[PDB]
From a paper:
Herein, we describe the biochemical and structural characterization of two multi-FMN-containing covalent flavoproteins, SaFMN3 from Streptomyces azureus and CbFMN4 from Clostridiaceae bacterium. Based on their primary structure, these proteins were predicted to contain three and four covalently tethered FMN cofactors, respectively. Recently, Méheust et al. discovered by sequence analysis a multitude of sequences of extracytosolic proteins predicted to contain multiple covalently bound FMN molecules. Such multi-FMN binding proteins are thought to play a role in extracellular long-distance electron transfer paths similar to multi-heme proteins. The crystal structures were elucidated, which confirmed that the flavin cofactor is covalently attached to a threonine.
The asymmetric unit of the CbFMN4-D1 crystal contains two protein molecules. The CbFMN4-D1 structure consists, like SaFMN3-D2, of an anti-parallel sheet (residues 1–9, 14–22, and 25–33) and two α-helices (residues 38–56 and 67–83). Hydrogen bonds are observed between the N-terminal strands of the two molecules. Tyr11 stacks on one site of the isoalloxazine (analogous to Tyr14 in SaFMN3-D2), while Leu40 is situated on the other site (analogous to Ile45 in SaFMN3-D2). Additionally, mostly analogous hydrogen bonds are observed between the O2 of FMN and the backbone amides of Val68 and Ser69, the N3 with Ser69-Oγ1, the O4 with the backbone amide of Thr37, and N5 with the Oγ1 of Thr37, while the O4’ of the ribityl group has a hydrogen bond with the backbone amide of Thr67. The structure of CbFMN4-D1 is similar to SaFMN3-D2 (their Cα r.m.s.d is 1.7 Å) while there is only 18% sequence identity. The highest similarity is observed in the FMN binding sequence motif. Structural elucidation of a domain of this flavoprotein revealed a similar overall structure and binding mode of the FMN cofactor.
Author numbering: 1 to 83
Write the structure that this text describes.
């Protein structure tokens, strides 16, 4: 099982995730660092990790108040899933 650290540019500055892969199964995604806007961006991240793990897919909807945080997570995970 592969273990990649990915970083993409969020709304409040870069975010850093740990993505865990097993074949093409996304096993997990931990947040190592985010400094997004409390009660908005941090929430969008938790939500997007949930969507992606449940959906086993990065073709999922943004959290609508927070497209920039949402796309950061989508983009970070797209990077890890091309390996």
């Amino acid at each position: 099982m592969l273990s990649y650290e990915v970083t993409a540019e969020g709304y409040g500055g870069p975010i850093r995730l740990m993505v865990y892969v097993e074949g093409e199964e996304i096993v997990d995604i931990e947040v190592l660092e985010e400094n997004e806007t409390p009660n908005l961006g941090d929430v969008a991240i938790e939500e997007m990790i949930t969507k992606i793990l449940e959906g086993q897919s990065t073709d999922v909807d943004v959290h609508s108040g927070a497209t920039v945080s949402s796309n950061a997570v989508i983009e970070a995970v797209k990077q890890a899933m091309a390996e």
